[PDB]
Amino acid sequence: PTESIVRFPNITNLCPFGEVFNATRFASVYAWNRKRISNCVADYSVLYNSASFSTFKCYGVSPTKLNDLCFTNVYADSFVIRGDEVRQIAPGQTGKIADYNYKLPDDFTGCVIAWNSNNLDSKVGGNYNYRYRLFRKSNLKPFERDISTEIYQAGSTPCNGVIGFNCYFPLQSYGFQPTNGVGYQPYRVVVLSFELLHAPATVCGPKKSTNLVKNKCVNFNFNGLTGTGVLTESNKKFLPFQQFGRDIADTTDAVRDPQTLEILDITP
Amino acid sequence: PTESIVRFPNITNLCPFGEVFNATRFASVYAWNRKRISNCVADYSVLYNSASFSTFKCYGVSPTKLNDLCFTNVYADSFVIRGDEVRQIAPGQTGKIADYNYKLPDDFTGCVIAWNSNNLDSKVGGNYNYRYRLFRKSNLKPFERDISTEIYQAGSTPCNGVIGFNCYFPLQSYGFQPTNGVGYQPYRVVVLSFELLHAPATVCGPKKSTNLVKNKCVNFNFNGLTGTGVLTESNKKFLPFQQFGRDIADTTDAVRDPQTLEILDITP
Amino acid sequence: PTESIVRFPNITNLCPFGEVFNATRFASVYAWNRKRISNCVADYSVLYNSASFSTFKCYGVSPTKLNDLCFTNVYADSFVIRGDEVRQIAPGQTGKIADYNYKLPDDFTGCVIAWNSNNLDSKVGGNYNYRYRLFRKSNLKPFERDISTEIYQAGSTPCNGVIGFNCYFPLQSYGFQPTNGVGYQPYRVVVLSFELLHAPATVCGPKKSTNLVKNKCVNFNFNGLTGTGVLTESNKKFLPFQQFGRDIADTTDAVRDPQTLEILDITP
Amino acid sequence: PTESIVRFPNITNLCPFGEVFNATRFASVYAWNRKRISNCVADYSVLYNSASFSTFKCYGVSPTKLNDLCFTNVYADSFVIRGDEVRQIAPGQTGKIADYNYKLPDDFTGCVIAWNSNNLDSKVGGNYNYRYRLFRKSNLKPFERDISTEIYQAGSTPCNGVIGFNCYFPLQSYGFQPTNGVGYQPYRVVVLSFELLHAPATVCGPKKSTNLVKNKCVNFNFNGLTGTGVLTESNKKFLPFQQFGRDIADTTDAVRDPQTLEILDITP
Amino acid sequence: PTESIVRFPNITNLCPFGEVFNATRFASVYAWNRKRISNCVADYSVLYNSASFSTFKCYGVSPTKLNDLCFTNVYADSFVIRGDEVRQIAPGQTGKIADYNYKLPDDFTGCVIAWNSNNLDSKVGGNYNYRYRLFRKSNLKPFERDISTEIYQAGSTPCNGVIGFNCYFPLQSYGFQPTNGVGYQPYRVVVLSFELLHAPATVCGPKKSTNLVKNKCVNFNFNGLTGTGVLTESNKKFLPFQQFGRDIADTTDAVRDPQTLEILDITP
Amino acid sequence: PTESIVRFPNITNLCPFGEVFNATRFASVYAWNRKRISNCVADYSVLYNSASFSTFKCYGVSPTKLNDLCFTNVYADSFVIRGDEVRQIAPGQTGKIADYNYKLPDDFTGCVIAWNSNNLDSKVGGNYNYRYRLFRKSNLKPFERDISTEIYQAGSTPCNGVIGFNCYFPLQSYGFQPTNGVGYQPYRVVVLSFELLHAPATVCGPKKSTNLVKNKCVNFNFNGLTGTGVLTESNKKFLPFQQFGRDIADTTDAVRDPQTLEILDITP
Numbered sequence A, B, C, D, E, F: 001p002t003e004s005i006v007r008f009p010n011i012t013n014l015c016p017f018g019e020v021f022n023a024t025r026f027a028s029v030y031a032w033n034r035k036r037i038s039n040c041v042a043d044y045s046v047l048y049n050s051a052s053f054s055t056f057k058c059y060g061v062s063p064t065k066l067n068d069l070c071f072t073n074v075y076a077d078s079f080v081i082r083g084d085e086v087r088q089i090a091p092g093q094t095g096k097i098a099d100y101n102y103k104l105p106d107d108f109t110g111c112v113i114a115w116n117s118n119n120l121d122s123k124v125g126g127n128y129n130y131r132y133r134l135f136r137k138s139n140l141k142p143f144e145r146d147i148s149t150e151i152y153q154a155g156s157t158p159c160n161g162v163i164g165f166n167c168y169f170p171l172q173s174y175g176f177q178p179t180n181g182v183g184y185q186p187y188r189v190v191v192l193s194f195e196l197l198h199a200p201a202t203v204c205g206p207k208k209s210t211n212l213v214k215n216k217c218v219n220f221n222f223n224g225l226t227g228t229g230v231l232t233e234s235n236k237k238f239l240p241f242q243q244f245g246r247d248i249a250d251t252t253d254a255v256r257d258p259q260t261l262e263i264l265d266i267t268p
């Protein structure tokens, strides 16, 4: 191959990562806010090169390569937790946050971002506006939220909606102090889950497209699908929903152009 | 003086310190339990010799000399706190327990007995039945309790007694676990308050009453009234409520016998 | 398989776990006490459900699946160690307790049960009755107890049976106090070690036996020997010590019934 | 006394305490910033009401009585130091800040106001902008500022104006991290200094100025001069520099009215 | 007064502060080594100005003024303790060291000099040669040395020279390691006690003797006795053991010259 | 095999570890000193048996098996750090010392030796002769040394080589004190890296050389190459740079003796 032919869709607007990562108030972990990111371009090397983030652990994908991939959808989950609970935001972990507040699936393709927010979220005299669910009958399914406020019966006696002996309120405040220990500062956590459905991808990295070159052995990056071959005109009539064609060997024979919406036939 | 004579009333019922120190369940610090001890002989040797009481700080009375004195009324304040906040139970300190839960007066005459109770008040998974008042409008008065449960407004919004943003429950749980450190481990605290007024003493030690030896220079202890003199037979007509007697110079010159109700002149 | 058949020997006495776990005085770690448990029914549910054991770590056996398995004999090793020495009671770990006091094998099968015992093993002023072996020439073998009290020759000079310079006593006191931190607090440790030999299993869980079903395909648990097959009456004669009849293919072909003493061939 | 009279000069402007306490960037402790507060009304109650301040130690004047008094001049000193070194801002105290950076007089009249400033002064990657003088040949005199950057010589070898072995820069960077403990936490300290010398007082509390009641026995606070008397007219020839007279008994008997510049007589 | 006359005895030999402080191995605190120091010039500013001692806290005398004083005898008591126990070497303090190992009288006059000794007194694997007395029936008297090794009876059972249950060895090892914390770190402590009683002075400071001038008003420092007066010839026949002279007014009116053994009349 | 033949060359001098480990002064971590050790005998068991080395971690070799295997060349890297960043001297670890001062490759072969030096590298009042590189624009490559003293521009403004606002000096002082904590105490670190490139061995340990026995199946160690064979005589034409010889089977079959320059055929 001589030169790569990158074809990405003609998207003009950047993804609203700034509003998600720089918002004034984040939600509590029991009622975490999920934002749907779609139909835009997202720069992921801005997040990595910024040294504000204490944690940038990515599972199932590499953080440096994130600008080269087109995901179908992005879900951004934002909440505030304790410092010692940051390690519970991982696939296959146990604890109060993992079981009762935010559960990550084992088959997780995404990145976990955690930065210290002692400056903006903590307050002297106590910031008790951040609460976490401490009591639940059963553990949470992955990507499930619990906003219930029913009194957790921890004994034989019914509670009748009144707090007291063995009847506790399900949500407990953190009590954040600026004079707290290293494990007790507020941490804002944004979990970026990359949905990779077999669909037209709408969140692409910031890569400049290259105009189409055919009839020669070239590299190509069609919607994040890297390959090498000769691109020719395809007689095959793809259905409108269909975006890829798979041979008997499960390798893409043809791809629908993401800019001019035509069919190109890949040959080795 | 030749010999020492001690005359006490013939009270043989032992004071209920077993109910105070060996109760199955204590109460929370916001609703600390007060017990009135009177009209019994008190044994403070069993408190002093015990090898479980980590803190035995006595204010206004010597801890070794608890057995010698006589009092009228004893107030036992039992509650459960954590280790770091045991130091707040003293005259003149600040903190959440001192300001909003239990305040000791600066003129406190009594002892503070604190011992670790990690085995009885901690449960694996958390023992949340012990609560403390965390928010209050104004600091507490000495020997004042606040068992009201009203939602504390921490902002400028009238939120109608529903927990949420800037409206917090007044009581917060300790959440005791056996794995927690000694700063956050349960400590049972019994505060003994002795009041010595111009009243006949009802709480005394187990000091034996000796025989009445008159017309000799003896050291004497009549119901806690120590001194030296030559006790003889009197002709004064005390009224039944009148225990001792005073001269023109406001010095004790006659006492009533605790046992046989006989008036004895103390000449020096 | 249509039905499930469980056959266990008709033994009814409970195993003396109460004597092991609720004893008033535990021995020191250098002279740890091993008790042989056999010929009884062991209910491991009462250990698991109760919330006092801070550390409950099983190696080689799933902790929640203790009830269904049958063991030949159980050895319970009890001792007292401080909080930072709890992590050394594990296979493959190092430390003073692992090298000189109690060493577990790398192939250990069983559970480690450690709970805080600050009330029973600490007195104010120091509880020095719990000693650990501090000096030894060589590390201990697995499950080997050393109670020798010769003076340790640290230097090049003969000790001559007197403590002095470069000659130390091998045992050293913990010195527990209730004010000490959780690293220096008493923990009572019971190590359950299960052996699975060719002997008949005597320590079985609280699972209840069912009726024997013959000539039909069932799923059977014969005294811990799980399997599936058509149980049929056999003409095989087993010697009294022999309990099962593995063939040339190392698969269980016949089992002696633990109650009625019947030889039962298994057809797949 | 029939009533109370408070006569203060007709000063309208509020004191610029917003530009001192809420300044964007404080100076370092080696070059601490001193601001002269005069000719304005000062409200010290609003400083005491805020719970942001973690240290409000006032020496020689009580914090509750701050609004009552009047002063001629206020010296507002501001700097940033770590949490462990807050205690060295005290009269008759020793330390690095006391010897080399900021020394208070042994008889100091004012308030040391220190609050935690983690949110304003810390940043990720460390805020090293705040420097403290660590090396000096001699200890600092009280209220003396040293901004010399000469290289301190520790050994006999002359430094020659370059950094090297035994020749160190006199200023050391603090190294404030958001993840540091409370010991190394950035704290902003404001040291208010008051002069009690007799002069025309320019700064007073927010107390309302009442009318002038003559020939009736009233309490008075004439520009901070507390007393009780019958305020009558005077025929004394007060010169312009003379603000309050005195008698042969060295007691205050004639005070100039601050608003009218009219001499009044205090009659007991 | 015109001149100042210092007369000290003609001694030149320096007493071994080097052997006290720079010894290779010190002694344990239960068997602290006391050395008698007499007939020497002692340069206390060598110990004061050297940046080697972490603590140089002096009781009853100023450390800077020690060069200008003369004492009859100096006791140097050297031992090794831990960092947290350095505080306990003081009058009116409690602990294990103060009660059982080294006790200081309440009228103590001297200095306590403590410096860290990590490289000398620690070893990887534990340095156990430094022992402290942990058990004693009664508290120690001031300056009492106890080197007895008898088994402490902490219970009712006789011990009979065998260590075991409730029978402990009285000496307990520190167990120093170089990786230990600064509280558990080996500190060498030397306590200097000065006999200021009425006796011939032997230990004197490095002040140089000046020539004797008579019949004028001069300040004088005769063997550490300071005054102002006129020195003249005296007819008082002193007995050879007598140094000072005194009258009914309890004032020193005659002294003996340290060098010429001449009796001088101090006329004021 | 019958006996083992260990053949080491005729080397008489010892490797100069004395000034590497027991030098009076060490260099700082930014200017880490490197010493090349070759052509001598090194006794690693002296370092192994030392009672002062707290950390003796090794990578790519066993800490027990370092003496018997002998290496081509030894690079000794010496620097002083504090106790917290001892863990940062490991491959793959991230930190200030790792990124900016001393970086080890991920395939590092050798041993890290660290020991506390609080009595040598700390002085009362502070020892500031040991510096570390705090700021660098890029992370260091493995084994590169950067001693540049250029002013680190931390802001946008060009300040032209002067210290000031965001123009920090790159080096900073540890500031060791004897009373500091174990994290802030000096630790001398000697990294002993070894390369195993294709070259004749120059440093080998103190193991003695045995006489040759030919025509018998003996275990042999020919200067780091260990095998089993019948070392018969040869007739090879080995050029003087050929240390050993390999056949078509890619196995060692001819070794020239290091002590006699005689080629020996290894026959299986």
Ligand SMILES: *[C@@H]1O[C@H](CO)[C@@H](O)[C@H](O)[C@H]1NC(C)=O
Residues within 6 Å of the ligand: A017, A018, A021, A022, A050
């Ligand atoms: C949030 O604001 C800061 C301040 O300018 C900026 O550096 C950062 O890049 C912003 N975050 C995002 C995701 O743009």
Ligand SMILES: *[C@@H]1O[C@H](CO)[C@@H](O)[C@H](O)[C@H]1NC(C)=O
Residues within 6 Å of the ligand: A009, A010, A258, A259, A260, A261
């Ligand atoms: C953008 O892409 C669409 C197909 O996705 C195409 O129809 C349209 O013409 C493109 N816009 C421009 C300006 O080329």
Ligand SMILES: *[C@@H]1O[C@H](CO)[C@@H](O)[C@H](O)[C@H]1NC(C)=O
Residues within 6 Å of the ligand: B017, B018, B021, B022, B046, B047
């Ligand atoms: C509580 O019970 C224990 C049980 O032996 C006893 O020793 C102790 O004296 C009791 N407490 C009081 C105050 O009597």
Ligand SMILES: *[C@@H]1O[C@H](CO)[C@@H](O)[C@H](O)[C@H]1NC(C)=O
Residues within 6 Å of the ligand: B009, B010, B258, B259, B260
């Ligand atoms: C006991 O005291 C009472 C006073 O209440 C008295 O009446 C009675 O006689 C006394 N009894 C004896 C045996 O002293």
Ligand SMILES: *[C@@H]1O[C@H](CO)[C@@H](O)[C@H](O)[C@H]1NC(C)=O
Residues within 6 Å of the ligand: C017, C018, C021, C022, C046, C050
């Ligand atoms: C020990 O005694 C307690 C007392 O309630 C009981 O709950 C526990 O089950 C006992 N332990 C065992 C192993 O039976």
Ligand SMILES: *[C@@H]1O[C@H](CO)[C@@H](O)[C@H](O)[C@H]1NC(C)=O
Residues within 6 Å of the ligand: C010, C258, C259, C260, C261
């Ligand atoms: C109990 O087991 C024994 C086996 O030794 C057997 O002989 C006996 O019949 C059994 N009893 C019952 C009631 O099953």
Ligand SMILES: *[C@@H]1O[C@H](CO)[C@@H](O)[C@H](O)[C@H]1NC(C)=O
Residues within 6 Å of the ligand: D017, D018, D021, D022
């Ligand atoms: C600084 O700003 C805060 C913001 O609300 C305010 O509450 C405070 O009073 C201000 N400080 C002063 C001295 O005015």
Ligand SMILES: *[C@@H]1O[C@H](CO)[C@@H](O)[C@H](O)[C@H]1NC(C)=O
Residues within 6 Å of the ligand: D009, D010, D258, D259, D260, D261
């Ligand atoms: C304000 O004070 C000045 C002098 O103190 C006086 O001359 C003037 O009349 C006053 N004005 C008012 C309105 O009181």
Ligand SMILES: *[C@@H]1O[C@H](CO)[C@@H](O)[C@H](O)[C@H]1NC(C)=O
Residues within 6 Å of the ligand: E017, E018, E019, E021, E022, E050
């Ligand atoms: C101990 O030896 C060192 C070595 O130079 C010396 O500086 C110090 O002054 C000596 N101390 C005494 C008390 O002699």
Ligand SMILES: *[C@@H]1O[C@H](CO)[C@@H](O)[C@H](O)[C@H]1NC(C)=O
Residues within 6 Å of the ligand: E010, E258, E259, E260, E261
């Ligand atoms: C030294 O002092 C003695 C008295 O103790 C005296 O007899 C002698 O003459 C003195 N010598 C000198 C040289 O001053």
Ligand SMILES: *[C@@H]1O[C@H](CO)[C@@H](O)[C@H](O)[C@H]1NC(C)=O
Residues within 6 Å of the ligand: F010, F259, F260
């Ligand atoms: C000493 O070394 C030389 C050169 O390496 C060698 O030729 C000689 O044989 C050696 N000496 C002995 C006794 O082997």
Ligand SMILES: *[C@@H]1O[C@H](CO)[C@@H](O)[C@H](O)[C@H]1NC(C)=O
Residues within 6 Å of the ligand: F017, F018, F021, F022, F046
């Ligand atoms: C450094 O000196 C000590 C002094 O005994 C010695 O034990 C040690 O072996 C020396 N270090 C080396 C590397 O030889």
